Symmetry: C2
Subunit: 568 residues, 2 copies
Amino acid sequence: SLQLRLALNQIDSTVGDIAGNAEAILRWTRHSAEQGAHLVAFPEMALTGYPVEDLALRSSFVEASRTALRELAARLAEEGFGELPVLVGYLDRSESAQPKYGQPAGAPRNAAAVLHRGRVALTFAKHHLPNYGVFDEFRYFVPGDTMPIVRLHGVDIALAICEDLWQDGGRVPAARSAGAGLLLSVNASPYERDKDDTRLELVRKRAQEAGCTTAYLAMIGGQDELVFDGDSIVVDRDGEVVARAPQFSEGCVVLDLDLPAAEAEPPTGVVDDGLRIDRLVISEEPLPAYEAELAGGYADRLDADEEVYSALVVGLRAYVAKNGFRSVLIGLSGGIDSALVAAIACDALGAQNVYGVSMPSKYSSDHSKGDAAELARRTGLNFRTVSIEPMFDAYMASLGLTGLAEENLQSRLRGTTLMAISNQEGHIVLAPGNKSELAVGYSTLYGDSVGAYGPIKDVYKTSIFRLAEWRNRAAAERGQTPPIPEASITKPDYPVLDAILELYVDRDTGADAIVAAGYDRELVVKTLRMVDTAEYKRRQYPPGTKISAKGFGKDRRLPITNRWREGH
Amino acid sequence: SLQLRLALNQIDSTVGDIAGNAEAILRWTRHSAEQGAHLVAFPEMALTGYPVEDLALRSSFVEASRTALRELAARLAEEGFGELPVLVGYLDRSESAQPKYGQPAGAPRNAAAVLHRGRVALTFAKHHLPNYGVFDEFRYFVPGDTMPIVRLHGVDIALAICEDLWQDGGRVPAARSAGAGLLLSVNASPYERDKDDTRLELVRKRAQEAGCTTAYLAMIGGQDELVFDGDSIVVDRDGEVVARAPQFSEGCVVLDLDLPAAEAEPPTGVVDDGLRIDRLVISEEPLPAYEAELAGGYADRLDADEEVYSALVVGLRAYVAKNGFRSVLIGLSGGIDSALVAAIACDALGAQNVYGVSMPSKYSSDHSKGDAAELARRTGLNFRTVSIEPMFDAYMASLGLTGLAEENLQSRLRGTTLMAISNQEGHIVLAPGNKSELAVGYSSVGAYGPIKDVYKTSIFRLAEWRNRAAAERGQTPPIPEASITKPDYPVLDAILELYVDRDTGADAIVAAGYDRELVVKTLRMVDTAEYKRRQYPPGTKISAKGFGKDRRLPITNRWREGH
């Protein structure tokens, strides 16, 4: 059967940096054309970045998106890629009012276009916009009611965007009745820790369902709280893995495929979900046969610890880099949390760009002071110490604080110290709070409530130990110095606590069901109560890397003012 | 045309306080029945509070709602009110899977029920759950598909909940095609500052469309950033106000109506949106016609400044009280914002429960201290003054900050002070920032921000109104005159209102008459202030379209508005 060479470019866009994203697309297309590619693909919304949020509700950004796509198509042909079809995600809008959905004038569409002959040759838009998920595209977006097909070199190529493939009955069976030979799906899929290979089972099912080879191209990188894992795959007609890209790295997959010829009298008009077939004929004629040397390759998988740790690195790196910043500032208590954050920061930015501050009190211990200095020594960290003891006395003199009030003073001092240093020196403060402390609203003591990014805020304490231990082990595996002091590692209880939180916060099981799983009623009700009342504390917590599907995402929330008590 | 006495109870529920809400519904029913009522109605989601947000998704909470409703009904008759139909809003879940909406059994519903004879005699749930609007029941909730009618003393009374009335072809025409005497709508509508009387506009258009007398009973009170403004209306068949409840007050409307009786053979089956008529009959036979005496009464309308001020008060009062607090702590400079916050707090809690603190630095001016001190005396608040200079010098001794950091240090020092005193004494710190400052990103910390959805231009207007209010009843003007009279703000706020509130673009703001360089600079400032307003405390909303969690921008964002 017919052969074709497809290049899939798993790249990293920056939200709003339209011109810079356009430059990268051009740069990666040239790099693709050199490898003999016949089609070049880029992820969902690659021109604008993702998720773009309320910037989708502005005519100026939509128009900037629209104009730049036209200019990129023209720049492609001017560079001599006018015969080369390039599929690019971008943001568009509906011109008409929408009677069929109930959307006004100029509602945005999550779109993708095929760039050919110095022009925009085809334009379709995401069809399925789910109720669930993180992105509220359902509220505001006009869907595409189109089944986009491209005749290229005798092959019908079907196109889709992300959540299209989540729908039972959408563009996947619509591709079948249109007689697709290759399904090309462009994606921006936020990372989600799961022991299942959710990516493979989705594409497997949908490839057999479409009855053709399915290519799934995904964005990589971090945007605010989210991280895109990459992990692009190609999977064949029978569900077997043709090629697979790495998790959490920029990269290209250029490969040769064997694809069925398209029916010379092909179907037209409405298909499965009510989608009209939008044909575009680049080449009706089959391509001259050539040596199919390239298979794409199966990139090495990451283990559970490595995979999470990588997401954390990419998350933190992107927040720093894409906001203009070079450097971070981390308060060092000698504790396990800060040590893991420092380690993540060194991998993200380089040790030169991470600055540590030890902030001791009069009654703060000597292993606290020591382990911070220890951590500094093994990382290459810019370490310093400033005692909060002088400011403590200054406050205590003209206030006279006792008990709970006087303990809270300590942390606000350290917060102020970190904030003041970063104001002078140009750093971003990192908040050290983990998911366990955040859930129950635990007292920070080193000013966790202060900070601009919280790298481990979605990681349970049980997993913090597991990640630190892996990291130290990862260093030793390659002769490098283990970064985290062992005294930091080895100094209701955490494993039971995190287990109950996982049931309640991530799997949304109630008190009755948690006790039935084998946990003690008193401590269950106490823990849940504490989670519920911690609302206001975590509404005001800094952004950080989300690695779970549901959790403390700003998407779901309890009232602050709330007299409901669980387990009455 | 028949008569019955209708008691509408404009009450304030507390979210999650199901026992306490049931306690309050019982006490208000007592007071309704003692005033000889034939029907008692309560607001939307009254048993539960509103909005409950993610509590709606918990089986434990949903079952606690349903059980309390059954326990309330059974308590009604045990208190000897079993003869009296009482309408209550509450949270329910679907018993069966409804494939029409594709929902599984147990999906949440915003419901209301008629309690009679110690039982739950009729149930129905909201039908229209809009894509737009502040709440998002649209996502999780399953619509009730009935058109409920009550036969009480020969009269057909049709029932609806809030957004049902927003729907063109909703339960409104369905009540006309069912032949209803009275349209009883129970509601929980948040406050929006609008010069138009949108409430009257809605209920007039709908009572005409229904072709009958329509009672819109609304919730009153504060919940987080939302304030419910009460203002219940009754409107006749033709569109004239029969009665009108006060704004921002708990109260009751008890009145008598003239209503058409319905047929001995009334309509049945599918109606307008496919709604099945669910009749409940308490009395088929008409009441012994007697001395019609209660008119209802149209309560006094607040003026624009008073309306906004009441909202701010009710919002603050609720956030203190419902959270088990008694007192607040407000930092005091000379400025207008701190003075107005103090003024609002004193009206909300009593001046005894308001604690002010002046926090002067190395070069803190005399009017700062003077006007702070002034405020305390003409108010009755608890004043104190702690210098931040002892702790400013301790920082600069070991840090040595230049211009950038050392100015910011002062703001953080004051925050630490406020939080420490509140930690010691049990006050809630109040954040003094306004909408104009918050949009731009200027400046701090606290639990509540009473004026955070109020522009600076409106801050003066409200301040001057409050002195004018004091003098109109022979009371001492609370806000110092020098505090009031200390991009320029009115052009700034005009641009912010165009951008933030009316969703107008740069080019169009320029077209409206504003200077391109200033517009661009302002809009740039607003876009980059995102991370600041994300970590800002809650506070009273007065406009549905403004800032909030519904509409937001990315923090990582290299888009720049303007060429």
